[PDB]
Amino acid sequence: GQAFRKFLPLFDRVLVERSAAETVTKGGIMLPEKSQGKVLQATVVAVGSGSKGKGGEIQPVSVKVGDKVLLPEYGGTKVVLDDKDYFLFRDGDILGKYVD
Amino acid sequence: GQAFRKFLPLFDRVLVERSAAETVTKGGIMLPEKSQGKVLQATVVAVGSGSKGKGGEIQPVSVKVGDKVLLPEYGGTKVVLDDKDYFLFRDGDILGKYVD
Amino acid sequence: GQAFRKFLPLFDRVLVERSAAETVTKGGIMLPEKSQGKVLQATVVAVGSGSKGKGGEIQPVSVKVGDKVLLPEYGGTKVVLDDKDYFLFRDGDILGKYVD
Amino acid sequence: GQAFRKFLPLFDRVLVERSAAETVTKGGIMLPEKSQGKVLQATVVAVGSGSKGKGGEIQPVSVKVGDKVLLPEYGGTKVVLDDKDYFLFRDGDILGKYVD
Amino acid sequence: VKDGKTLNDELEIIEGMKFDRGYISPYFINTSKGQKCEFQDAYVLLSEKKISSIQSIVPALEIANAHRKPLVIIAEDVDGEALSTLVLNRLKVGLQVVAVKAPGFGDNRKNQLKDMAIATGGAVFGEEGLTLNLEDVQPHDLGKVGEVIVTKDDAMLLKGKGDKAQIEKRIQEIIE
Amino acid sequence: VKDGKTLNDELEIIEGMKFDRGYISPYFINTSKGQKCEFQDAYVLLSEKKISSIQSIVPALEIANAHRKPLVIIAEDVDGEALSTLVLNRLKVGLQVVAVKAPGFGDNRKNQLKDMAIATGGAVFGEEGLTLNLEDVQPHDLGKVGEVIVTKDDAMLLKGKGDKAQIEKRIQEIIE
């Protein structure tokens, strides 16, 4: 498993960073802040070593660092690193990967 | 597992597209939009690589891409790709396959 | 497993000590006590011998004593040792490790 | 497993005696009875033979008789032996051991 | 002026710091006299909000018993738990304590307890923006009063060693 | 015209920007005089809605303490948490602050706080369609006032460095 700035998740946790806030629209209009919620697209920066549940050898996380992923809506813990909010999910909870 | 337009589901997830909206009837009449609900017949476009739960080797998804399936009613996450709503289910939740 | 001052946690339990209270701010201001909650950063001081659940041989705890960890928010039992409050978590509940 | 005065716990149960009531304080003051709750420090007097759940051979209890332990808060059954209240916990529920 | 009861007029000069409020439990009476609790060279614990649990009250009584001096507990109220601890310590071996509520409705007491503190010398515990708690007290944090009388309806503190140079500043504050 | 109390008539010319509202906590008084908080060359933090948490209030106080100037906090209200932080910073080492509610009651306050802002020079935080938050403030985002007097019932800002060329535009707006 790979770490981040003085941080390392345990057994499954993945530390991701949500993407931009989408302030303005596509064409020409601009949006407020109470709207737009939390962006579900994120990038993975920290990955736990391997899955505790796997018998004998640990089962390594599948999402590798530097990937873009479609986060779920609810599950996730807020961590603060360098005054930047990062979100720690579980590897099972990550919906999809933006491979391209 | 096979991917889609810059998207790839995780272990069991399957990305399908619901079929037409059924605007008009069979014979000659036409229907509104608040009715007709969400169509349960869909086509599978993205398939996760394999089942995490299977010990040792991964268990690959059964529904292969390009098939028509009878979706369930409740379970499913709304994803947006290219401004088109696609729905991510789990492979266990897909009721039946329209083989023909 | 390693013990502490006349104390030794059972199978999965891990005993940690929360970090400072953060009385003043970074720049120049100073804060009250009803605020600031409970610090989530702690140091592990006691570690149970091994995991009971593991078949045959015990599975040892991974967080080793003397490490800094990002505790969870809810789970944890309050123990008092030498008139100092220490908190006993389970090893699965510890979110991250501050490796550096 | 070892027994007690005409008593023997089954498959996991541990019979322990809670420590003193802490009537007076450290320095010089003295306390009432409605306060002070139930002491969490106890001594183990009876230990079940072995764990039923373990496949094939039984998994023996870890806390051995004559030890001091930090009991949990809730779990526990009240038994009366010789007009003395003893409490039967499960071996998993015992938080820590006072080794010294 | 008040409606008297005798046949003649009477001039009553209430001296010291007296407030129309007596002890809570009728077990602190150590006088063998007309229902009075009488202390000399006593400590004073001034609390703004209630003293509910046995936890908060124990350190002050520890200090008092260690120094072996009586103690008055002027607080918003003494809950049944700390009250039971106090009465228990009183009826057996004999720690010298007594408890009383505050003088004034909501707001006046917040000033009057501060006046009492600086008149005897100490700190009001539980203040809004001071962050003083009962759990961390010290012998220099308790007020000292020469003579204390507590009957069933009124408490009188007489000789507060309260650093007159600061009570004079308080007097100037209140006159302004 | 008002019902006077003296024997003669009196002409009282309320000068500057005065509103009938005083400080919240009686701990900001640094005058040793007739119950006044008196500042010179102070900053002004104008908030439309309440300042509830310790989070939102800390950056403004950080700016004030860094620049070492007093601060007035004119808001809809100061919640007990930010209020406790302010009083704590006041009673110990001595950050110079003082807080007051808004003058107006309804929409009139929504206009009057903007008037005060442009008269002193700054931005009202929490506006409906402006998206200005307290967490991101800057030294040029706070108003500046030459002299401030806050008593128990009224606050007076006297000299607002507020870019008179724009307050004149405001005056034309209100006259139209």
Side-chain angles (χ1 to χ4, degrees), chain C:
Chain C
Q2 184 173 0
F4 195 72
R5 296 177 184 176
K6 297 180 288 295
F7 184 78
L8 184 63
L10 274 72
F11 302 98
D12 200 4
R13 279 71 177 268
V14 174
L15 181 65
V16 297
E17 181 180 1
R18 290 188 184 273
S19 66
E22 183 64 25
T23 61
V24 301
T25 196
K26 280 73 177 175
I29 202 170
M30 173 167 57
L31 283 73
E33 295 295 328
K34 284 87 171 65
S35 179
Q36 70 190 357
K38 291 181 181 179
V39 63
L40 294 175
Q41 295 83 16
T43 61
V44 59
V45 297
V47 175
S49 65
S51 177
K52 184 177 180 181
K54 183 64 70 177
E57 72 276 16
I58 62 171
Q59 185 66 41
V61 178
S62 289
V63 294
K64 66 182 178 66
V65 68
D67 291 331
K68 295 181 289 294
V69 297
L70 181 63
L71 302 180
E73 183 179 1
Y74 291 165
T77 300
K78 181 178 178 181
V79 302
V80 61
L81 280 71
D82 292 331
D83 290 331
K84 288 181 71 174
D85 292 331
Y86 294 154
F87 284 163
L88 186 64
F89 295 171
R90 190 174 296 278
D91 182 70
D93 293 331
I94 297 171
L95 276 297
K97 185 184 286 185
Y98 289 163
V99 298
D100 58 356

Side-chain angles (χ1 to χ4, degrees), chain F residues 86-129:
Chain F
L86 295 173
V87 299
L88 187 65
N89 291 315
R90 177 66 179 86
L91 276 69
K92 52 186 177 182
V93 66
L95 183 63
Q96 292 178 356
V97 298
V98 64
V100 296
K101 294 181 177 67
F105 188 75
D107 192 0
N108 193 357
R109 74 176 69 188
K110 275 72 177 174
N111 290 318
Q112 189 173 1
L113 276 74
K114 181 69 175 177
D115 292 331
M116 295 176 70
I118 61 173
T120 186
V124 59
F125 294 100
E127 186 174 0
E128 293 85 3

Side-chain angles (χ1 to χ4, degrees), chain E residues 128-167:
Chain E
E128 293 86 2
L130 185 62
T131 309
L132 268 291
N133 290 318
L134 294 174
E135 290 82 2
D136 54 357
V137 298
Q138 293 179 357
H140 63 86
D141 198 1
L142 280 72
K144 294 182 289 296
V145 292
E147 199 276 331
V148 180
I149 295 169
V150 176
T151 62
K152 293 179 70 67
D153 201 2
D154 54 357
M156 185 181 287
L157 300 175
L158 280 71
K159 293 185 286 185
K161 281 74 177 175
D163 192 359
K164 297 182 289 294
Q166 184 177 1
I167 65 171

Side-chain angles (χ1 to χ4, degrees), chain D residues 24-55:
Chain D
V24 301
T25 196
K26 281 73 177 175
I29 201 170
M30 171 170 57
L31 285 74
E33 296 296 327
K34 284 87 172 65
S35 178
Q36 71 190 357
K38 291 181 182 179
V39 63
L40 294 175
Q41 294 83 17
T43 61
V44 59
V45 298
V47 175
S49 66
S51 179
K52 184 177 180 180
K54 183 63 70 178

Side-chain angles (χ1 to χ4, degrees), chain B:
Chain B
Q2 183 173 0
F4 195 72
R5 297 176 184 175
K6 297 181 289 294
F7 183 78
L8 183 63
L10 276 70
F11 303 97
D12 201 3
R13 279 71 177 269
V14 173
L15 180 65
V16 297
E17 181 181 1
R18 291 188 185 273
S19 66
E22 182 65 25
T23 61
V24 301
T25 196
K26 281 73 177 175
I29 203 170
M30 177 177 64
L31 284 74
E33 296 296 327
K34 284 87 171 65
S35 179
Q36 70 190 357
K38 292 181 181 179
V39 64
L40 294 176
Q41 295 83 16
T43 61
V44 59
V45 297
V47 175
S49 65
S51 177
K52 184 177 180 181
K54 182 64 70 177
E57 72 276 16
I58 62 171
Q59 185 66 40
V61 176
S62 291
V63 294
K64 66 182 178 66
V65 67
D67 290 331
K68 296 182 289 294
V69 297
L70 182 63
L71 302 180
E73 183 179 1
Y74 291 165
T77 300
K78 181 178 178 181
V79 303
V80 60
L81 280 72
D82 293 331
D83 290 331
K84 288 181 71 174
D85 292 331
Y86 293 155
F87 284 164
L88 187 63
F89 295 171
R90 191 174 297 280
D91 183 72
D93 294 331
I94 297 170
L95 277 298
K97 185 184 286 185
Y98 288 164
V99 298
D100 58 356

Side-chain angles (χ1 to χ4, degrees), chain E residues 127-131 173 176, chain F residues 27 32-33 35 87-88 91:
Chain E
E127 187 174 0
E128 293 86 2
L130 185 62
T131 309
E173 190 273 332
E176 292 180 353
Chain F
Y27 291 163
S32 179
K33 187 66 177 177
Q35 300 294 319
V87 299
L88 187 65
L91 276 69

